[PDB]
Design a protein around this nucleic acid. Structure first.
Ligand code: K
Ligand code: K
Ligand code: K
Ligand code: K
Ligand code: K
Ligand code: K
Ligand code: K
Ligand code: K
Ligand code: K
Ligand code: K
Ligand code: K
Ligand code: MG
Ligand code: MG
Ligand code: MG
Ligand code: MG
Ligand code: MG
Ligand code: MG
Ligand code: MG
Ligand code: MG
Ligand code: MG
Ligand code: MG
Ligand code: ZN
Lengths: 96, 153, 60, 82, 114, 205, 127
RNA sequence: UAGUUGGGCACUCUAGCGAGACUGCCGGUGACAAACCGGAGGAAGGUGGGGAUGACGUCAAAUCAUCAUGCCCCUUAUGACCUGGGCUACACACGUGCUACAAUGGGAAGUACAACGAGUCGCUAGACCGCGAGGUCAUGCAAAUCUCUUAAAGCUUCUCUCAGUUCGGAUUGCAGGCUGCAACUCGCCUGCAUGAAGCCGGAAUCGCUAGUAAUCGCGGAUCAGCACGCCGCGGUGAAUACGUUC
């Protein structure tokens, strides 16, 4: 089984990863990871002013930190365990 | 700058002649950071020198530098309502800089089709104490001598 | 004529190429980000407020 | 240019008008706002009053004119000089 | 010489052919391919037989006065029908839609300071 | 010269996003749904002392944490008011809306609430100096390490607008670690808008 | 027995391995002359051997990627110096005084907003 | 055939947690200070490089056309719908850029090395047709997995031989490709044909102190389509700073 975690904040992301790994390991399944993935970055530059004044800009960046988990020899309990373990809303989670 | 003299960045010696002066010449001839073309041109010029003359091109080029490198320059000074030139001894770093700049500029201005050909010809003439580069050095010393009255300044 | 323009933009366009984006917050036609559906002005305002998830001042 | 597979372009209303007047002993001016419509061999011999943005200018169509858009034959803006 | 124009002698055959009106570098390559003549050989070296074969190929192609007459008829046609392009041609302005506030010097001619 | 937004400067350093959700294909839709939600709440609870709206999304569900200094007023009797709010928000959004109310202890340390108070008083034609002075006093009593306030516009109906401000303690906007709250509020008067700006520097993080 | 090293220059990273031999160098399964056809660059690569007096003693196998040829050459040089430290600690003094061990930190400076390059500014006319 | 497969994560890499640089230590100067000069060590030394960050205020500076708003004006019209046109005009003047004027080059062939980023009706493999722009079938990928994406300068050979040219690529003719309901006004791109001025630029004026200038490409936002502009990335990579009179 494969689990892809994504979040805008690596801190909460790592907390959720710890929870996933701990619950799987407790349920007896073997887990590979957490595997950091290349964090995605998107950049936006906007004119700071509302009218003319092209030179003065400001730059915003949105970062997506991603983690990967691979569960091996999944017990029947682990599948429902990893669906009961509910992550904070700030983390997007994918399974397989 | 205002604070004071800054450090000079070093140049490693040329790979095949084992000289820093050759590397500086390569840099001078380089354009748009195309050091490959620059180094190739310099080596071809030295090959032509070793061909047209049986001597070592490096020694020939050092002789050309000796002939072209100035000794007294003129620095402009604004004295009240009058601005005029003043003779000034040249520090050795500026000597090499002027030598390379003059040689390369007049090499580019020569009439031969290819730059390495022009460069080799100019180097040989300078070593022979003739050519545009030596002429420019003569003019520099001549201007310095004419304004020699201002040495006290 | 901003209100009528906003209404017409909301309505389906007669031809596909006529369809264009306006800042859904203020209706500005220019500089509308597809990801956020906001003009540059409104994007910067809300991003400062911290109400756009993930976005933050860039620096590198 | 216009893709060959697409074929020539003409506004349907203009084409319908010229078609209706094909069997006409004497052609009557066809008034169109459509600049886009391409001229056709059928269009030959007709006088078409094309809108220029302020009024319909008549143009007599000929086999020499065909192959071009109508709007090109009606200038938009006037420049007398300085 | 070949098509009524004395092509340069020293140059390579492909370039000498380009000197003919209506023939560009691609067309020169094509005609030489048909005739079998190598591109590198100079025209002065080219044998009279190769020159005759080249003449045949050019005569197959349209060049010089024929080409010029064709283009002038097209331009005359636009002007006579009074198309927008014809008016551009008549008044010496860009036909292809360029902006004329600046530049346009090629069509306009030398600047007039007034 | 201009200054960076005090909150926007620290978002992602010590302050966190209010819209606490992640989305890729529905990012724009969710963002605009949140904006409409915020506007609707602002209109609805204008009289209540609502400051911060934190929105979390869980699949079709939407959890909304509303911080207020008047939780009783927001809730109503037996949750009647919060329930009416939920139904209206469900109609608005088109999905299940769960609402969680949070009590704003120490309202004197909230930038938006302090700014709102000053704007209300200006609308009622209180002396701007008096409004700002008492706001600063209350904030310092609450324990803010520093506070700064500013009012700009046609003060007292003057034809020439100007800006008058006051401060107390420390408000080092350039110190990133400092927990400085900020908010801009407008008071609609007879002569036009007056801008109110409040900076509140709490215990640094 | 192989002595490993990692070198970096600009965006280039070079994993270097020294194996005793005749001084032959191979990069990405290809000889140094093929890969880096610039004699000056090749001499740069061999500098560490010269200072350590270990000319010809060690053959080098390098897996390098990123950056360009000059950057990858610098990375090879850095990795070679580190590999020599593994071979003999006493080379540290000569290597350090030659400055071969220092990781050249000069990277590309970011383009600034409003400036055409990192420092180049748009041409300015007063009136 | 392939990092392929098995196998291993060692290395690189990725990304969390940390370590590291503090004038911390050594010597000299200094008013027993601040501090300054030099040294050792170290990847990095004195703010290591760069970014973000912009005090009170100044110019009744800019914006009532992002938005909001006091007051004033219009209310079958200064409001609203539609087609077409204009904002793209062109005796002229200026700013900012791109391309050049050639041999440190042009052309042909071969060969090598990046980074930042984008991708669902979106990136599109591979194959076939096309001189080409592209087209057909069709594959993988919501992506460190697939693709855009073998980057260009570069290096190696051949050719051109100082020519307004094999430089230059404007304008123009014809013929096409796309996108789109539609390309005349008024898109970008392709082929053939044509082959403009231009031979390094007066007075004057601009940027830049190192991975910088110079130069070379690559990506992206807007976006059906359309950039020499903007934002960002990497490749190659210099010259000079005596000095503060002006
Ligand atoms: K738009
Ligand atoms: K135009
Ligand atoms: K201009
Ligand atoms: K690490
Ligand atoms: K307004
Ligand atoms: K107004
Ligand atoms: K101007
Ligand atoms: K430009
Ligand atoms: K060549
Ligand atoms: K058009
Ligand atoms: K585009
Ligand atoms: Mg559009
Ligand atoms: Mg010709
Ligand atoms: Mg145009
Ligand atoms: Mg004013
Ligand atoms: Mg104005
Ligand atoms: Mg108004
Ligand atoms: Mg305009
Ligand atoms: Mg010439
Ligand atoms: Mg500086
Ligand atoms: Mg660069
Ligand atoms: Zn907006």
């Amino acid at each position: 089984i494969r689990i892809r975690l994504k979040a805008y904040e690596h801190r909460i992301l790592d907390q959720s990863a710890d929870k996933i790994v701990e619950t799987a390991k407790r349920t007896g399944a073997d887990v590979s990871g957490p595997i950091p993935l290349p964090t995605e970055r998107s950049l936006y530059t906007v004119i700071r002013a509302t009218h003319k004044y092209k030179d003065s800009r400001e730059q915003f960046e949105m970062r997506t930190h991603k983690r990967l988990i691979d569960i091996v020899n999944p017990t029947p309990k682990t599948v429902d365990a990893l669906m009961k373990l509910d992550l904070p809303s700030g983390v997007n989670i994918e399974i397989k | 700058p205002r604070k004071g003299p800054v450090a000079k960045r070093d140049v490693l010696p040329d790979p095949i002649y084992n000289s820093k002066l050759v590397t500086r010449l390569i840099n001078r001839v380089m354009v748009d950071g195309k050091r490959g073309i620059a180094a190739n041109i310099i080596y071809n010029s030295f090959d032509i020198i070793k061909e047209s003359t049986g001597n070592d091109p490096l020694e020939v080029f050092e002789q050309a530098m000796k002939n072209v490198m100035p000794v007294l320059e003129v620095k402009a000074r604004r004295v009240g309502g009058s601005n005029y030139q003043v003779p000034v001894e040249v520090r050795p770093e500026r000597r090499t800089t002027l030598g390379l700049r003059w040689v390369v500029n007049y090499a580019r201005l020569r009439g031969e089709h290819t730059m390495e050909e022009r460069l080799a010809k100019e180097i040989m003439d300078a070593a022979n104490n003739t050519g545009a580069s030596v002429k420019k050095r003569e003019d520099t010393h001549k201007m310095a001598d004419a304004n020699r009255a201002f040495a006290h300044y | 004529a901003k209100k009528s323009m906003i209404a017409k933009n909301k309505r389906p366009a007669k031809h596909s190429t006529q369809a264009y984006t306006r800042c859904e917050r203020c209706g500005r036609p220019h500089s509308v980000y597809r990801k956020f559906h906001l003009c540059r002005i409104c994007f910067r305002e809300l991003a400062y407020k911290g109400q756009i998830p993930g976005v933050k001042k860039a620096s590198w | 240019g216009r893709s060959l597979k697409k074929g020539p372009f003409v506004d349907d209303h203009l084409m319908k008008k010229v078609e209706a007047q094909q069997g006409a002993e004497k052609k009557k001016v066809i008034k169109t706002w459509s600049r886009r419509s391409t001229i056709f061999p059928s269009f030959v011999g007709f006088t078409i009053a094309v809108y220029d943005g302020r009024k319909h200018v008549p143009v007599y169509i000929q086999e020499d004119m065909v192959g071009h858009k109508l709007g090109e034959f009606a200038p938009t803006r006037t420049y007398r000089g300085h | 010489r070949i098509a009524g124009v004395d092509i340069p002698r020293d140059k390579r055959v492909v370039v000498s052919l380009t000197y003919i009106y209506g023939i560009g570098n691609t067309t020169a390559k094509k005609v030489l391919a048909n005739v079998g003549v190598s591109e590198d050989v100079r025209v002065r070296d080219l044998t009279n037989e190769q020159t005759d074969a080249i003449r045949a190929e050019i005569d197959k192609l349209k060049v010089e006065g024929d080409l010029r007459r064709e283009v002038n008829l097209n331009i005359k046609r636009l002007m006579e029908i009074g198309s927008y392009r014809g008016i551009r041609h008549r008044r010496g302005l860009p036909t292809r839609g360029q902006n004329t506030k600046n530049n346009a010097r090629t069509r306009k001619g030398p600047t007039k300071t007034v | 010269g201009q200054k960076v937004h005090p909150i926007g400067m620290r978002v992602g350093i010590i302050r966190d996003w209010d819209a606490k959700w992640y989305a890729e294909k529905e990012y724009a839709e969710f963002l605009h749904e949140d904006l409409r939600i915020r506007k609707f709440i602002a209109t609805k609870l204008a009289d209540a002392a609502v400051s911060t709206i934190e929105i979390e999304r869980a699949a079709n569900r939407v959890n909304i944490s509303i911080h207020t200094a008047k939780p009783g007023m927001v809730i109503g009797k037996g949750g009647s008011e919060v329930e009416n709010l939920r139904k209206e928000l469900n109609k608005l959004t088109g999905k299940r809306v769960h609402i969680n109310i949070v009590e704003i202890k120490k309202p004197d340390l909230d930038a938006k609430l302090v700014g709102e108070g000053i704007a209300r008083q200006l609308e009622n034609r209180v002396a701007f100096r008096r409004a700002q002075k008492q706001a600063i006093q209350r904030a310092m009593r609450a324990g803010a390490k520093g506070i700064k306030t500013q009012v700009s516009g046609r003060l007292n109906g003057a034809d020439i607008a100007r800006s008058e401000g006051y401060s107390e303690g420390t408000v080092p906007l350039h110190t990133l670690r400092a927990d400085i709250d900020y908010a801009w509020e407008e008071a609609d008067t007879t002569y036009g808008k007056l801008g109110v700006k409040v900076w509140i520097y709490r215990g640094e993080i | 027995v192989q002595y490993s090293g990692t070198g970096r220059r600009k965006n280039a990273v070079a994993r270097v391995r020294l194996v005793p031999g005749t001084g032959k160098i191979t990069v990405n399964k290809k000889d140094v002359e093929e890969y880096i056809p610039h004699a000056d660059l090749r001499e740069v690569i061999n500098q560490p051997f010269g200072v350590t007096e270990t000319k010809g003693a060690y053959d080098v196998i390098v897996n390098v990627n990123g950056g360009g040829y000059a950057g990858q050459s610098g990375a090879i040089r850095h990795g070679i110096a580190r590999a020599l430290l593994q071979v003999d600690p006493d080379f540290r003094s000569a290597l350090k005084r030659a400055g071969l061990l220092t990781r050249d930190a000069r990277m590309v400076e970011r383009k600034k907003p409003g400036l055409k390059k990192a420092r180049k500014a748009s041409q300015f006319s007063k009136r």
